[PDB]
């Protein structure tokens, strides 16, 4: 600690006083993972290996829940030419938890797959299928010439009144009009049937051959995790500082039995600061109180390097059961200084009416402050004390007036 | 007819525990002191719009109401959701129902066809007391909250306060714009409750030590 004080002061000599050199934080003893006990694997097969993909104008949405979703196999598959994830990295997907994962599958012409991303523009992004600007998920596409080719069954919407909102789909088939005439059920002046087929010939030009594209969308705000990666739950431990992971909720703290009256549908509890402070263990279903691991500033009491190299360390606001002479001072328990029942003037303050000093074979002592010498004034209803002499006292007083005029 | 909702219809916005805290939240709440339509269905049950969410309340001695119907066309053309409680079980299913002009239950009735979802469990309606419900359909989730309270006021909602807690939370994800309640009758002559629509409002919720909402403030009221 003396070298720490020298280092933080950036000086080889240290004056008498108390210096905050570093911050103490009891480290996590173990790592804990508690994922839900879901056994069944996730039906990604029927999403990607489906017999037929819907047209881009009428993209098909599947809802995915109650999964042990293995995204490593999808990521490592060589079929996918484009594996792009925006709100999450592909490697991390095997260790996250999601609620109500969606999978939007549809077929699309090749080079225009770049329109499938946040903030894009173009006919597919504008008028057929649009992702939100804050999209969190992955866009997965691959060549499908050997399956979707010629073939003319698949279509895409060319004509439409306005840009689509995110994740809406248009099924209307009425004749759009670009001209002013009422083109009611007829392709009149500058009027067209809104849907026209793709020309997926078996050897169409590069970028025109069909592409099957699947878009995975993840929701994270909702409490109960239903889709989770294939992590392995660790045995639970309580009453010690550990790294914990409940349904993807990474954190560090001390887990303790909770008295909070969680209802069965409730999984988490939030503090007044709107931070998670309680959690239901997803296997035992018991409620565990989360508290931060003990921490506090570290202060070094130094008599001065010119006086001695001995020092005492104060760990602020901690109990000495967590720290690894020892004394439980109210302002954080103090080590390296011996408590003494005497009382002296405050040499080096610590807190809570306790100070430390270097005194007599000398050592750093710790004592309660003596406010002053006791005095009982000899008051009586007919007694007065009058001075018979005097002393002229000259006392110096120093006052700052100015400081240097920097510019 | 119309009546005044004296701070009724507030519910737990999310399924997260909060205790001894005043929480400000933005969600589709029923405005305080709003006009709730009072339907004297017993001397009928019209199809009513579903304006982003509905607050439904009723009080009868004989539990005439037994369920609800949701959808857009309420015919075979579009998917529709059915909830109904008979004497022993609830049944929730989402099918292209061909609903008749007057849906009800006899001393028992269904129109299901060609569908995907079904569920059964104990009934939340049972055989004086006020039954309140709040319906929502957002982000692909269809949700029902509920709360049952004894009362003594005869022909108006009580002045008291009680938050509605979740009762149903399903990821049905169907389009809903209209709904209609259904009743149980001792007759089959095919040809009472309050309704109020939710609005986006900012509320301040007082959570007590036990985690229950004990009071609330409608920030835009006054």
């Amino acid at each position, epitope marked *: 600690p003396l070298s720490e004080t020298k280092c933080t002061l950036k000086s080889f000599t240290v004056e008498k006083g108390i210096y905050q050199t570093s911050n103490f934080r009891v480290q996590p003893t173990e790592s804990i993972v508690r994922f839900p006990n879901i056994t069944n694997l996730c039906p990604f097969g029927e999403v990607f290996n489906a017999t037929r993909f819907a047209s881009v104008y009428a993209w098909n949405r599947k809802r995915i829940s109650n999964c042990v979703a293995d995204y490593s196999v999808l990521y490592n598959s060589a079929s996918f030419s484009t594996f792009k994830c925006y709100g999450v990295s592909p490697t991390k997907l095997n260790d996250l938890c999601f609620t109500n994962v969606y999978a939007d599958s549809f077929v699309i012409r090749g080079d225009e797959v770049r329109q499938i991303a946040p903030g894009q523009t173009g006919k597919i992004a504008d008028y057929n299928y649009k992702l939100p600007d804050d999209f969190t998920g992955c866009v997965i596409a691959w060549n499908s010439n050997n399956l979707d080719s010629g073939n003319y069954n698949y279509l895409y919407r060319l004509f439409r009144k306005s840009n689509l909102k995110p994740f809406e789909r248009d099924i209307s088939t009425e004749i759009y009009q670009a001209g002013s005439t009422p083109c009611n059920g007829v392709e009149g002046f500058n009027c067209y049937f809104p849907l026209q087929s793709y020309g997926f010939q078996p050897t169409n030009g590069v970028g025109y051959q069909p592409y099957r594209v699947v878009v995975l969308s993840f929701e994270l705000l909702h409490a109960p995790a239903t889709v989770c990666g294939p992590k392995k739950s660790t045995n639970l431990v309580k009453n010690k500082c550990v790294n914990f992971n409940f349904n993807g909720l990474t954190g560090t703290g001390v887990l303790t039995e909770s008295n909070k*009256k969680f209802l*069965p549908f409730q999984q988490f509890g939030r503090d007044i600061a709107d931070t998670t402070d309680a959690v239901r263990d997803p296997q035992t279903l018991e409620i565990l109180d989360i508290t931060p691991c003990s921490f506090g500033g570290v202060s070094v009491i130094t008599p001065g390097t010119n006086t001695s190299n001995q020092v005492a360390v104060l760990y602020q606001g901690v109990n000495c059961t967590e720290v690894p002479n020892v004394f439980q001072t109210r302002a954080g328990c103090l080590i390296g200084a011996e408590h003494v029942n005497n009382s002296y003037e405050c040499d080096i303050p610590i807190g809570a009416g306790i100070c430390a000093s270097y005194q007599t074979s000398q050592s750093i002592i710790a004592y309660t402050m003596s406010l002053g010498a006791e005095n009982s004034v000899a008051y009586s209803n007919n007694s007065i004390a009058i001075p018979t002499n005097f002393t002229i006292s000259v006392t110096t007083e120093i006052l700052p007036v100015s400081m240097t005029k920097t510019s | 007819a119309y009546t005044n909702s004296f701070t009724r219809g507030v519910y737990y916005p999310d399924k997260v525990f909060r205790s001894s805290v005043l929480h400000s939240t933005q969600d589709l709440f029923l405005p305080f002191f709003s006009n709730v339509t009072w339907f004297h269905a017993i001397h009928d049950n019209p199809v009513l719009p579903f304006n982003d969410g509905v607050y439904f309340a009723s009080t009868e001695k004989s539990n005439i109401i037994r369920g609800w119907i949701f959808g857009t066309t309420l015919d075979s053309k579009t998917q529709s959701l059915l909830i109904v409680n008979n004497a022993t079980n609830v049944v929730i299913k989402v099918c292209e129902f061909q609903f008749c002009n007057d849906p009800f239950l006899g001393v028992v009735y269904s129109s299901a066809n060609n569908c995907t979802f079904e569920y059964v469990s104990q009934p939340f309606l049972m055989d004086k007391n006020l039954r309140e419900f709040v319906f929502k359909n957002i982000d692909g989730y269809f949700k029902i909250y509920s709360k049952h309270t004894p009362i003594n006021l005869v022909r108006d909602l009580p002045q008291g306060f009680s938050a509605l807690e979740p009762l149903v939370d399903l990821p049905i994800g169907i389009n809903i714009t209209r709904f209609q309640t259904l009743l149980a009758l001792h007759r089959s002559y095919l040809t009472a409750y309050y309704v109020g629509y939710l609005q986006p409002r900012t509320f301040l919720l007082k959570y007590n030590e036990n985690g229950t909402i004990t009071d609330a403030v409608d920030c835009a009221l006054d």
Partner: antibody
Amino acid sequence: QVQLVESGGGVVQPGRSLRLSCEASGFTFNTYDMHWARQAPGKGLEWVAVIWYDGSNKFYADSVKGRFTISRDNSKNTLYLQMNSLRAEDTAVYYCARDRTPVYDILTGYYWPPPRVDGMDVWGQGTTVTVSS
Amino acid sequence: DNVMTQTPFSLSVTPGQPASISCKSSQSLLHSDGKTYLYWYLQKPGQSPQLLIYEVSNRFSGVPERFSGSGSGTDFTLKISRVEAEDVGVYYCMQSIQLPFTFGQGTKLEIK
């Protein structure tokens, strides 16, 4: 079949503490509330205590208030009862018993009936606790 | 407290004869949900109790059909259509409307 196996009996002196244990198998343990009940010899049954499915809510009978602590560990499928501060009248056979009503499966969207304590469904083998000088 | 009683303290029944054993309570067992909360348990000589009737008229799964019961308010009774030899034991009635769960003092059933 529903299996409950009590353990932790024997003879003891007044004033000390003891632990009973109940193994459970053959059903989803963590979703069921659990009861402790006892039968003193030659006298009728007596409900001792009940624990909630998550262990959140605990209740005990008037004869045992302040003293007994009911606890469970859903990971091990075990139920416990800490027998602090014994007197002679605690001489009895003790049974761990299941609650008839399990809580609703939250993975389904339906949250009715509210979780409530109900009578004893299935009773275990039972063990004898004798406290006397 | 919901004190409860059963009479007669011991009923002696020939094999095959019907039997009737009663239970009573101080306060009504009807709950605000509409259910009437009464539970009955059979304890034959030499093992733990067995649940027979879980609501006033509802027999537990696996119970033989001969067991049946009825009642309302504070008066309840269980009927046995015909007493067989294994029915010997002590019958305990219990309320579950409020905690603590209070049993009756128990009533013996024996062969004449």
